Homo-oligomer: A and B are copies of this chain.
């Protein structure tokens, strides 16, 4: 399926893992996206209000589900039904976020 993992402890919360499904969805290769913040999928018609909700969820370190317009590598639009989830270590400190993406 389609999922990624980011490290919020790294500069700009970059993707450190992406499934093959994510690669197929976005048309990007693994080498092209590792180490980058997932926001590169956003564009002109992406709703900023929804991005803010994502930003608030990340700050508050809570799970969230939103729906927003993303763009493929070739410039094709798709609605991304995005589910985010924080992962904590054994000491209860924030360690990762994981996201599950769905093409509408």
Contact = CB atoms under 8 A, between A and B. Distances in A.
Interface string A73-104: 00000000000010100100000101010000
A60 interface: no
A8 to B, nearest CB: 14
Interface residues of A, number: 14
Main secondary structure of the interface of A (DSSP, over half): strand
A20 B84 CA distance: 11
A31 interface: yes
B100 A1 contact: yes
A19 interface: yes
A5 interface: yes
Interface string A22-53: 00000000110000000000000000000000
Interface of A: 1, 3, 5, 17, 19-20, 30-31, 85, 87, 90, 96, 98, 100
Q: Which 3 A-B pairs have the closest CB atoms?
A: A1-B100, A31-B90, A20-B85
